[PDB]
Design an enzyme around this catalytic site. Structure first.
Site, PDB file in Angstrom:
ATOM      1  N   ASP B 199       0.808  -1.225  -0.027  1.00 63.05           N
ATOM      2  CA  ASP B 199       0.044  -0.115  -0.059  1.00 63.05           C
ATOM      3  C   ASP B 199       0.859   1.272  -0.149  1.00 63.05           C
ATOM      4  O   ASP B 199       1.369   1.714   1.011  1.00 63.05           O
ATOM      5  CB  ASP B 199      -0.855   0.134   1.185  1.00 63.05           C
ATOM      6  CG  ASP B 199      -1.459   1.281   1.404  1.00 63.05           C
ATOM      7  OD1 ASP B 199      -2.694   1.560   0.533  1.00 63.05           O
ATOM      8  OD2 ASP B 199      -1.139   2.385   2.158  1.00 63.05           O
ATOM      9  N   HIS B 389       7.568  -2.220   3.616  1.00 66.28           N
ATOM     10  CA  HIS B 389       7.755  -3.594   3.972  1.00 66.28           C
ATOM     11  C   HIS B 389       8.707  -4.006   2.789  1.00 66.28           C
ATOM     12  O   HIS B 389       8.405  -4.630   1.963  1.00 66.28           O
ATOM     13  CB  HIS B 389       6.296  -4.161   3.612  1.00 66.28           C
ATOM     14  CG  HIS B 389       5.095  -3.792   4.315  1.00 66.28           C
ATOM     15  ND1 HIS B 389       5.413  -3.530   5.575  1.00 66.28           N
ATOM     16  CD2 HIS B 389       4.038  -3.083   4.067  1.00 66.28           C
ATOM     17  CE1 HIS B 389       4.204  -2.797   6.192  1.00 66.28           C
ATOM     18  NE2 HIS B 389       3.332  -2.911   5.148  1.00 66.28           N
ATOM     19  N   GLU B 459       1.201  -9.163   4.190  1.00 69.96           N
ATOM     20  CA  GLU B 459      -0.117  -9.505   3.980  1.00 69.96           C
ATOM     21  C   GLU B 459      -0.013 -10.157   2.514  1.00 69.96           C
ATOM     22  O   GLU B 459      -0.247  -9.755   1.541  1.00 69.96           O
ATOM     23  CB  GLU B 459      -1.128  -8.312   3.525  1.00 69.96           C
ATOM     24  CG  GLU B 459      -0.583  -7.036   3.700  1.00 69.96           C
ATOM     25  CD  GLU B 459      -1.336  -5.938   4.339  1.00 69.96           C
ATOM     26  OE1 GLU B 459      -1.711  -5.977   5.407  1.00 69.96           O
ATOM     27  OE2 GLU B 459      -1.828  -4.927   3.404  1.00 69.96           O
ATOM     28  N   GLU B 535       1.523  -3.705  13.439  1.00 66.97           N
ATOM     29  CA  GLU B 535       0.978  -2.513  13.198  1.00 66.97           C
ATOM     30  C   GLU B 535      -0.365  -2.172  14.031  1.00 66.97           C
ATOM     31  O   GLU B 535      -0.947  -2.869  14.145  1.00 66.97           O
ATOM     32  CB  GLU B 535       0.195  -2.698  11.677  1.00 66.97           C
ATOM     33  CG  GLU B 535       1.346  -3.133  10.518  1.00 66.97           C
ATOM     34  CD  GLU B 535       0.767  -3.187   9.323  1.00 66.97           C
ATOM     35  OE1 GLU B 535      -0.100  -2.798   9.082  1.00 66.97           O
ATOM     36  OE2 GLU B 535       1.578  -3.597   8.434  1.00 66.97           O
ATOM     37  N   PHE B 599      -5.927   7.526   1.651  1.00 68.26           N
ATOM     38  CA  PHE B 599      -5.465   6.421   2.516  1.00 68.26           C
ATOM     39  C   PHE B 599      -4.006   6.317   2.322  1.00 68.26           C
ATOM     40  O   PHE B 599      -3.312   5.521   3.176  1.00 68.26           O
ATOM     41  CB  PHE B 599      -6.189   4.976   2.061  1.00 68.26           C
ATOM     42  CG  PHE B 599      -7.243   5.050   2.912  1.00 68.26           C
ATOM     43  CD1 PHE B 599      -7.127   4.761   4.251  1.00 68.26           C
ATOM     44  CD2 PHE B 599      -8.591   4.697   2.144  1.00 68.26           C
ATOM     45  CE1 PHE B 599      -8.300   4.453   5.051  1.00 68.26           C
ATOM     46  CE2 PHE B 599      -9.615   4.702   3.188  1.00 68.26           C
ATOM     47  CZ  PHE B 599      -9.416   4.477   4.498  1.00 68.26           C
TER      48      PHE B 599
HETATM   49 MG   LIG Z   1      -1.217  -3.411   1.841  1.00 67.70          MG
END
Ligand SMILES: [Mg+2]
Ligand SMILES: [Mg+2]
Ligand SMILES: [Mg+2]
Ligand SMILES: [Mg+2]
Lengths: 1021, 1021
Positions: B199, B389, B459, B535, B599
C-alpha cells in the site's frame, strides 16, 4: 530467426542453475483425461492419451554448437532410425561411464565441458484434426537425461532439467493439421549434472516414455486424496480436493465416486469454490468433497486392498466434460512415541534399495522387468523398497500399490563428489534448483497409497536447503514422515534416524559424522526417533555375512525397525566379441575413465535377475514365522501385523544323518502377531549312531499374485539328539607295505599305492590300480582368492593398507616358503605311520607350522591329522586347510552337511544340515568378479568319484584353482583346469560385508586362536 | 545480434517467475575494497568504490518494444538529461499511482500489460587503465524498480528483479580503456510486480545509488559476525567466518581485528581451511576466527555501544591484499519462556512502521531525511522501527546501528490484492522467486547489530513457502527471531504473535483469521509466544484515539511486549498552483486510477517531517519514566533496562488556576527498572478559590547525539486540591431593560444590547455600542465535519452503512430542522430571563430537544443553561454544543484548560491543565484532508478579543466553518471566512483510531447518555 539454434544456444541455459525450465507446465498426478466414466473407472485406455513411443530419427554430435541449423527444418540425411525410449550409450554412440563419487566432469559448477555429447532426436507425425478444433494438446516427456531444448514445426517450444520427473509443454499453438515434425536436442551434461551424481552408470538420451495428451479447455488440473480414521479404523473419511483450469461457470460441478470393484461405496457432488481461508476469501476454482466410509478395508503390504476413485467434471445438467481417476488405499502412516506405526501397528521394515537397471536396455524400464523384480522381492520376504536415488518410472508406484510393497520416494538430488558434501545444498543460489526436485516429486506421486515416506535425496551432506525442504513437505503433506541421511543421519531434516552401513555393536566414530552402533544410537541423550537403516548389508559379491546379527537386533529392540539392503541388482552391462557372444561388463570395460571397476556390482541378484546365494540368507532371516522348540512342542510365532496365517502348511521331518525317519504336515492357524503350538507325535528313538535332526517348512498351498502353489516361505531346523559311535574297526587280514627309496616312500596295499616325496614331505601321488589320482600333491593352504570385501577399495596404485588382502600380501602369506622340518615313516603291527612337520616362512619369519601324521591301515583307510600353529603377530589367515588337484572329473557331488547353497561361517543360518547331491556345475558360484566361492560348511562326509572323505570340515570343489581365480578379472575369462580342485578346510574366515570399503569381518569370525586342530579320513570304494 | 533488442526482449523475461535474474553475482555484506587497513578501520572512503550517481541521459517509452535499436549503439537526440537516482514520475514522464490493495495492473499472473512504460537510462564514462590491468570491476544497482536488462559497450550483460535489494554484475570483460557507455533499460511491470503490492505510491526507475567496485582477483567474498556470551555477559566470544574467492595459495592469511575506539581489543590471524563438516572434509576456502572479549560493552537502543571489526586478507610475509570492515555490537536477542529478551532483559517495543518517502523526491532516500527521521523518533520516545515492507537503504542500517534503534528487516514480498491472499505464496512455482527475496536480504543485512528480527514479508496470507523460508532463516541464522503476520498472525511461520490492528479488549471474530483482543490471544489454549503488534493505532488524520488503552495493557501484561504504530510519514506528494504555489497531493491527484484517495496519509508527521498533534500523545504514553504521587511524595520508576538516569533533572511546579505558587528541581537518580523517591517540601494551601495542580517534568540537561540541551523527555501532573467558590456576586446598581416587539426581544444595559429573534428562538445579535458582535446567530450544534475515522472507506459509489458518517447522514443529523416550541421573556428583580425550547426533526422523527435559559443580569453577564434530550434510537451524535460566527478577528487565543495542543476526549493524556495563549493560527490543524480539528477539552475559561466565556467545555475556534471543512477536499482549497467561527461543546464524541476502516470509537467515548446538560457564562471586557 529467434528460433534459430544460433540464437537459442547463446544463453547457455545448461550452465545456469537459475534456469531449470522454460515454458514447462506444472506438475500433477497422472491424467488420461477420460471422456467417459466407466472407462475411467475400470482403467481402460484413453483415446486422449497417445504414445509417441517407437522409431525416431537420431543423430549424435560432440557438441550442441555443431548441430546444423537445417536440423530445425530438415531431417539430416546422415540420420539413423532408433527406438524411443532408449539410452544412447546402448546404441554405441558414445560410452557409458561408471564412477561412484567422482564426478564424471570437471568440478566447476555451474559450468560443463565444451565437449558435450549432444543427441538430436526427431520425429514426424500426424495429429487428428479433431484435436485441433477444441481442447489443449500437450506433449509429456517421462524422462530425459540430462537436459533438453524442444521444437515443433520449426518453432522453439521449451526447455527442461531433472532427468527423473516428467516435463510437460503445451503444443496447441504449434500443431498443424496433418504432418508435424518434433525436434528434441538432448544434452549429456548441464548444471543439472551436479545434482545427479548417483553411484551408477552415467548414460543419457530420451529414456522414458513420450506421450501426447488432449485436454478440454476447462479441465481438472490437479487433485489430492486423503484419509482419516477414528481410534480404531472402523470409520474413515476420504477427503478429495479438486482444482480447475479454464473458464469458471456456475454450471460446473464435480462428482467424486469411490468404488469397490463393481460396487459404488460413496459419492459426492458439489460445485466449485471452497472455504474462506484468508482475508481475501477462498478458492473459486477448487473444491473439497468428503466421503464417509464405514469399515474400510485397509491397505498394507500384507493385504494391498485398493479402492477406485473417479473424479468427474461436468455440467449441472450432468454433462461430462472430463474424467480422472486413481486407485486409493486406506492407511495411516504415523510416528508415535518413537515408533513408526502403520494402521496402528509398528512396522518391521524388510526392504531393499533398487535402481532402474537393465543389462541390455540400460536405464530403460518396462513392466516385465518391474514385475519380475516385484515377484522376486516378495518371494524372498521383502516388505519395502527404496527408490535409490531418484523418482521412478511412473508405473512402478502403481505396481507397488497393487502387489503390496512399501515405497520410499526419493528426490533426484545427490552431490556426493562435492567437497565438502554441503557445498551446493547449503547454497541459497541452489535452493531454487533443488526445490524443484522435491516439490514436483510430491506433486506427482502424493496420491499413491504405497508411498509411505518421502526422502530428500541422497549424500548431499547437510545444508539449509535441506531444512527448507523438509518443512515444505511437512506442510503440504503432513501425512507421511520425512527422511534424509546426509550430514549424520540424525539431523533436523529427518524424522527418522536413517544411517547407512552402521554396525550392530561397533561404533565407527568418524569426526563430524560418526556411525554409532545402532543399539547405541537409540539411547543417545535426548534421542527419541525410530531407527531405520537406509543402507546396510552391502551385498557386493560374496557378501551378506553378519546378516543374522541385524535381524536379531531388529527383533529385539522396539525402535530398531528395519532397514534397506544395498542393493537389488548388479549394474552390469552386456558386451560381446567374436561370435557376438555376450558377457557381463563393469567399471572400466568401455574405455571409461575414470571408473570404479566392480563397485557397480552389489546386488542380491545378477543383472539378469538370477540369484546370488546371499539372497537366501535374506529370505531366511526376514521370515514371517519364528519357531521355538520345547520338548516335543513347536511354538509358532507370527510376525504378520494384519493377516491371519490362511495359506499355510507346516511340514516337519525327522532324520538320521540324512535318513528320513518320519514326516508330517500341520496346517497353520495363527493370528497376526500371535502363537501356535504344534504337538509332535512321539519321536523315533534310534540306536544306530548318528545325528537326529528336526526340520520344518512353511508351505503355501495356494498360489497368489506373487507366488505359485507350493511356495516355501520359512524353515527352521533343530538337532534332536546325537548317538556317538563306539564301534571297532574290522580286523584286517594284512597290513600296508612300507617301502623306502632315495626319492620317496611307497606304501601299498593291494591295488592301492600312496607315494610320499621325501624332499617335499607331501603325499605327492596316489594310485588305484594303474590309475594315478592326483595332478598336484596334497598340501596345506592358508590363503584365499581374496573376496571383494577382502579387497575393499585397494588398488595397484592406491593401496589401502587395511584391507585384509594387503595385510595378507605384505605379510607374505601368498609367497611363503614351505619347509620340511621332519618326515618319518614307521611300520607298526596293525598299520603304517608317516609323520611330518613343516614350517612356512617369509623373509626369515616363520608364519605357520604344520605338524601331521598319516596312518594307513589294513582297511586301506588313510587317517590324516593336522595340527597348526599360527604366529600370533601375523594377520589372521583366511584359511586353515589342505588342497590338491584331482585327476578325476565326475558329474555329481554328494555330501552330508550344511547345504545346498554356498555358505560361509558368518553366512550360513539359511543352510540346513542334510544329505545333498548336486551337479559339479552347481558348486561354483559365477560371481562376475572371480574370487573364493562355492564353500559349504559343517561337512561330515564328502563324496566325489571313487573317493570319500570324512571328518568335520568345510570345502569347495571346482575346475579352477584359487590362483586362477585370483588372477582372472572377469568370469568370462576363466578356463577350466585339468581335473578338479579340492579345498578342504578345517577352519575358514568369515566373509563379512557390513560394508565393502573397510574391514568388516567381526572377531568371532577371525581365525585367531593361535592353534588349530583337524582330522580327516580318506578312503575309496 | 544476440545483443540486439529484438533478441533480448524475445524471451520476455519480465513475464516469468522462472527468471528473476541473469548473470547477477551473489549477495553479501557491504564491500568497499580498502587497500589500507586504517582507512578501513576509520571508515574512510575507498578509492576502489566509485559512485555513478549524477547526470544521465534518459528517454521514456510506452513499451519495451518501442525502443530503437540505435539506443544500444548511440544516444538518442530526443533524450534528456536527468539526475540519478530518481523516480521517473517525479519528472513528469508518467503518473505515479496510489493504490492499497488493488494491483495497478490487471491480475493475470505472471503476465504484465503490453503497455509498459519503459525507461531507457544511459551513461558515458571513463575507467582508469589500472582497473583494467588487474582485478575485477563490478557494477552495483542498489535499487531499480521493477526490473531491467543491462548492456555495456554494446553488449548484453545480464538482468534483475526485486526493486529493494542490490544487483551486482561483473563488467570486467566488457570495459575498455577510456570511454564506456551503459544502457540500462528499466521496466515498470514485471512478473515481480505481483510480489510488490505494498500500500503505497506505485513509482518506478533507478531509485537508489549506482556504483563501481574494483576488487582484487583473489578476494574476500563473504563474512559473518557472531557474538556469544557467558551467563552474565561478563565474557563474550566473537566468531568471524571469512570466505575467499579466487586462487588459493598456502601463503594466504586472514587477520581479524577488533577495535574499540583507537584501541585494539583483540585480533586473530589464520590460514584458510576449516573443520571437517562431512564425509568429504570441509571448506578449503574459508576460515573462522574466534576472538575472546572480556567485559565487552553491550549494545542497546539505550546505549548503542559499537566496536569496529577489521578483516585483513594478506600474504604470510605481510603483504596486504584487501580489507573489509563492519561495526559490531555485542548483544543477544533470545525468546525465552514466552518472552523476547535483549541481553537478558525483556524488551518493551515502542516503535513505528516506516516507509521510505519524500515529498519532493518520491522513493529516493538521503542521509539528511534518514537522519531526520532518526532524530524525531528518538526525540518522541520511539524505540524501534519496522521496514514496512522491504529492505531499506543500506545507509539506514548503519544509522540505526549508530543512533540506536531496534530494526525489523522485512522482505520485499506482498501479494495483498490476490485472491485468496495465498494464491502465489502457497504455490511451488513461486518458491524460487520468494526465496530469492528472503535469502538475499539475510545475506546482506545479517551483520547489523540494529537488526533484531527478521520478517518474511506482508499480507500475503500464509502459504507453504512461508514455512520453508522460515526454517531456512532459522537454520542459516539462529541469532534473531522470525516473525510474519499473514493468515492469522499466529501461524507456524512466526516466532511471535504479531497481529495488525487487534483491539485491546474487543474481539473481532473474522472468519478463518480472527483478531482476538490482545489480552485474550496470549491465553488461548496451548499458546505460549510473546505478542507484539506489527501494526497498531492507525494514524489517519485526526487520530490515535485510545492509544492510552494499549500502553496500559502493554504495561500490565508480561507477554504483551509492544507494537509498531501505523505509520510514520504521510505519503503525500507536492504539486503547484498557477501562482507558483505548492500543495500537498494525494491519491487521484495525478489522473491516476484506480486510486485509494487519502489512504496514503496515516503518518504521525507531515510529509515535511512536521508533527501532527498526535505525535505528543505517543510521546507521553511511551515515556521511560513513570510517576506515582503519594501525599507529597513523588515515586519515580525507570523503564530503561540498561541505563541509569545520567542526564535527568525533574522539575516540579505547583499552581492555582494557572498561577504559579511554587517551583523546584531535583536531579534524577534511578537505576534501570528501579524506583526513586522524591519528597516535596511543604506546599502552600492558599485560601483562594480554585484548583491546585502539581506538574512534573523530566528535562535533559546535556545534549545528546540525538537531542538538544533542555530536552523534555517525560511529564507528571496531578490535581492536588480544590477550593469550591462560595462567593456571591456583589450587588449591582443597574438592571437590564427589556423591550418587547412582535419579532424580537431587545435587552439593554449600558452600551450593550442583546437581541433574540422571536421566530427563530435564537440569540440573533449582540452590540457593544454601535458595533455588532455576531455575523451568525448562536445555535445548538450536534454534528462534526467528518473525520477520517468517521468516514472509513465510505464512498459515494460504495456506501459504507456502518460508518459513523453514514449513520449520522442516514439519520438526518446533518439536515434536521429546528422547530420553535417556546420562547418567552420574563422580568425579575435583578434581571431578565429568556426561555426557549427547540426540537430537531427529520421526516417525522424528533432527534433532539434543546431547552435553554438565558439570564442577563445588571452585572452585564449572560448565563446560558443547556439541557438536551437525544432519542435513544438515534445514533450518538458527534457532539452536543453551540456555535456562532463572530465578527471580530483577534490575534491570540487564551484559555484555562487542556493544552496547548489539539486534544480530544479519547486523546488528552498528553495535555496538561494550564493557561494557554496562542496565535489564532495554532488553533487549526492543517490535516491535508479537511475535517473537524483544533479542539481543546476540559476548558474552564476562554478569551477572545473582548469576549470571555466561562463554564466547563471543549471548544474549537478558527476561520473555517464546519460546513466548509466538510466541503473542501484539500487543505489548500480552504478560504478564511469573514469572522471567526466558534464551537463550544458541552460534550464531544471521541475520535477513535484503532483502525480506519471500521468503527473504532469505544463505548466510554460515545454520547449515549440520553440527556445532557451544560452551563455557560458569556460576558465582555
Ligand atoms: Mg497492503
Ligand atoms: Mg540450467
Ligand atoms: Mg554416492
Ligand atoms: Mg521473470
Amino acid at each position: 530467426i529467434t528460433d534459430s539454434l544460433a540464437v537459442v544456444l547463446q544463453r547457455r541455459d545448461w550452465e545456469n542453475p537459475g534456469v531449470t525450465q522454460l515454458n514447462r507446465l506444472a506438475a500433477h498426478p497422472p491424467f488420461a483425461s477420460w471422456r467417459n466414466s466407466e472407462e475411467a473407472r475400470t482403467d481402460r485406455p484413453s483415446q486422449q492419451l497417445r504414445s509417441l513411443n517407437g522409431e525416431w530419427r537420431f543423430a549424435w554430435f560432440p557438441a550442441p554448437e555443431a548441430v546444423p541449423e537445417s536440423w530445425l527444418e530438415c531431417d539430416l540425411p546422415e540420420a539413423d532410425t532408433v527406438v524411443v525410449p532408449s539410452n544412447w550409450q546402448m546404441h554405441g554412440y558414445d560410452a557409458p561411464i561408471y564412477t561412484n563419487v567422482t564426478y564424471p566432469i570437471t568440478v566447476n559448477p555451474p559450468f560443463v565441458p565444451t565437449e558435450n555429447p549432444t543427441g538430436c532426436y526427431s520425429l514426424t507425425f500426424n495429429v487428428d484434426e479433431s484435436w485441433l478444433q477444441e481442447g489443449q494438446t500437450r506433449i509429456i516427456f517421462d524422462g530425459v537425461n540430462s537436459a533438453f531444448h524442444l521444437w515443433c514445426n520449426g518453432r522453439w517450444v521449451g526447455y527442461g532439467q531433472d532427468s527423473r520427473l516428467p516435463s510437460e509443454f503445451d503444443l496447441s499453438a504449434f500443431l498443424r493439421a496433418g504432418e508435424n515434425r518434433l525436434a528434441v536436442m538432448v544434452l549429456r551434461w548441464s548444471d543439472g549434472s551436479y545434482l545427479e551424481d548417483q553411484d551408477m552408470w552415467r548414460m543419457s538420451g530420451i529414456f522414458r516414455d513420450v506421450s501426447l495428451l488432449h485436454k478440454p479447455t476447462t479441465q481438472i488440473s490437479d487433485f489430492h486424496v486423503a484419509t482419516r480414521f477414528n481410534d480404531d479404523f472402523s470409520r474413515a473419511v476420504l477427503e478429495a480436493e479438486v482444482q480447475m483450469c479454464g473458464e469458471l461457470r456456475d454450471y460446473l460441478r464435480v462428482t467424486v465416486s469411490l468404488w469397490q470393484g463393481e460396487t459404488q461405496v460413496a459419492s459426492g457432488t458439489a460445485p466449485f469454490g471452497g472455504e474462506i481461508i484468508d482475508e481475501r476469501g477462498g478458492y473459486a476454482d477448487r473444491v473439497t468433497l468428503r466421503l464417509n466410509v464405514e469399515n474400510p478395508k485397509l491397505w498394507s503390504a500384507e493385504i494391498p486392498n485398493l479402492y477406485r476413485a473417479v473424479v468427474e467434471l461436468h455440467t449441472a445438467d450432468g454433462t461430462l466434460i472430463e474424467a480422472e481417476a486413481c486407485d486409493v488405499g486406506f492407511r495411516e502412516v504415523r510416528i508415535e512415541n518413537g515408533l513408526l506405526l502403520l494402521n496402528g501397528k509398528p512396522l518391521l521394515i524388510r526392504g531393499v534399495n533398487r535402481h532402474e537397471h537393465h543389462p541390455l536396455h540400460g536405464q530403460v524400464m518396462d513392466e516385465q522387468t518391474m514385475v519380475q523384480d516385484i515377484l522376486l522381492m516378495k518371494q524372498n520376504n521383502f516388505n519395502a523398497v527404496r527408490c535409490s536415488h531418484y523418482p521412478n518410472h511412473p508405473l512402478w508406484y502403481t505396481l507397488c500399490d497393487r502387489y503390496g510393497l512399501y515405497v520410499v520416494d526419493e528426490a533426484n538430488i545427490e552431490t556426493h563428489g562435492m567437497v565438502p558434501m554441503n557445498r551446493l545444498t547449503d547454497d541459497p543460489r541452489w535452493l531454487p534448483a533443488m526445490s524443484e526436485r522435491v516439490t514436483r516429486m510430491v506433486q506427482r506421486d502424493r496420491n499413491h497409497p504405497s508411498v509411505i515416506i518421502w526422502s530428500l535425496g541422497n549424500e548431499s551432506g547437510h545444508g539449509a536447503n535441506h531444512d527448507a525442504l523438509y518443512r515444505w513437505i511437512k506442510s503440504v503433506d503432513p501425512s507421511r514422515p520425512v527422511q534424509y541421511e546426509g550430514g549424520g543421519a540424525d539431523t533436523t531434516a529427518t524424522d527418522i534416524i536413517c544411517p547407512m552401513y552402521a554396525r550392530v555393536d561397533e561404533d565407527q566414530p568418524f569426526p563430524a559424522v560418526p556411525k554409532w552402533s545402532i543399539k547405541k544410537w537409540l539411547s543417545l541423550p535426548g534421542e527419541t526417533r525410530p531407527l531405520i537403516l537406509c543402507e546396510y548389508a552391502h551385498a557386493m559379491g560374496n557378501s551378506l555375512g553378519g546378516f543374522a546379527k541385524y535381524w536379531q537386533a531388529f527383533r529385539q529392540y522396539p525402535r530398531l525397525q528395519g532397514g534397506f539392503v544395498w542393493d537389488w541388482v548388479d549394474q552390469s552391462l552386456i558386451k560381446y566379441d567374436e561370435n557376438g557372444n555376450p558377457w557381463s561388463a563393469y567399471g572400466g570395460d568401455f574405455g571409461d575413465t575414470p571408473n570404479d571397476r566392480q563397485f557397480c556390482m552389489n546386488g542380491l541378484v545378477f543383472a539378469d535377475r538370477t540369484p546370488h546365494p546371499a539372497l537366501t540368507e535374506a529370505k531366511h532371516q526376514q521370515q514371517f514365522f519364528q519357531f521355538r522348540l520345547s520338548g516335543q512342542t513347536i511354538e509358532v510365532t507370527s510376525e504378520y501385523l494384519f493377516r491371519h496365517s490362511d495359506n499355510e502348511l507346516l511340514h516337519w521331518m525327522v532324520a538320521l544323518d540324512g535318513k528320513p525317519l518320519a514326516s508330517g504336515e500341520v496346517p497353520l492357524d495363527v493370528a497376526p502377531q500371535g502363537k501356535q503350538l504344534i504337538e509332535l507325535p512321539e519321536l523315533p528313538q534310534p540306536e544306530s549312531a548318528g545325528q537326529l535332526w528336526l526340520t520344518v517348512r512353511v508351505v503355501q498351498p495356494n498360489a497368489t499374485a506373487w507366488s505359485e502353489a507350493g511356495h516355501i516361505s520359512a524353515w527352521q531346523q533343530w538337532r534332536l539328539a546325537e548317538n556317538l559311535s563306539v564301534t571297532l574297526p574290522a580286523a584286517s587280514h594284512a597290513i600296508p607295505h612300507l617301502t623306502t627309496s632315495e626319492m620317496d616312500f611307497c606304501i601299498e596295499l593291494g591295488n592301492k599305492r600312496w607315494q610320499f616325496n621325501r624332499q617335499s614331505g607331501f603325499l605327492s601321488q596316489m594310485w588305484i590300480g594303474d590309475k594315478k589320482q592326483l595332478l598336484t600333491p596334497l598340501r596345506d593352504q592358508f590363503t584365499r582368492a581374496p573376496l571383494d570385501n577382502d579387497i575393499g577399495v585397494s588398488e595397484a596404485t592406491r593401496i589401502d593398507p587395511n584391507a585384509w588382502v594387503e595385510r595378507w600380501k605384505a605379510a607374505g602369506h601368498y609367497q611363503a616358503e614351505a619347509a620340511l622340518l621332519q618326515c618319518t615313516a614307521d611300520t607298526l603291527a596293525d598299520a603304517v605311520l608317516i609323520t611330518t612337520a613343516h614350517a612356512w616362512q617369509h623373509q626369515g619369519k616363520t608364519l605357520f607350522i604344520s605338524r601331521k601324521t598319516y596312518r594307513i591301515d589294513g582297511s586301506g583307510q588313510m587317517a590324516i591329522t593336522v595340527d597348526v600353529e599360527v604366529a600370533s603377530d601375523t594377520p589372521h589367515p583366511a584359511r586353515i586347510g589342505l588342497n590338491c588337484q584331482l585327476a578325476q572329473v565326475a558329474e555329481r557331488v554328494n555330501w552330508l552337511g550344511l547345504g545346498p547353497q554356498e555358505n560361509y561361517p558368518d553366512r550360513l543360518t539359511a543352510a540346513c544340515f542334510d544329505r545333498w547331491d548336486l551337479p559339479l556345475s552347481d558348486m561354483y558360484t559365477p560371481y562376475v568378479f572371480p574370487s573364493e566361492n562355492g564353500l559349504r560348511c559343517g561337512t561330515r562326509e564328502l563324496n566325489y568319484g571313487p573317493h570319500q572323505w570324512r571328518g568335520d570340515f568345510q570345502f569347495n570343489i571346482s575346475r579352477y584353482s584359487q590362483q586362477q581365480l585370483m588372477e582372472t578379472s572377469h568370469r568370462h575369462l576363466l578356463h577350466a583346469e585339468e581335473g578338479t580342485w579340492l579345498n578342504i578346510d578345517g577352519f575358514h574366515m568369515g566373509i563379512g560385508g557390513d560394508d565393502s570399503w573397510s574391514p568388516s569381518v567381526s572377531a568371532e569370525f577371525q581365525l585367531s586362536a593361535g592353534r588349530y586342530h583337524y582330522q580327516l579320513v580318506w578312503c575309496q570304494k
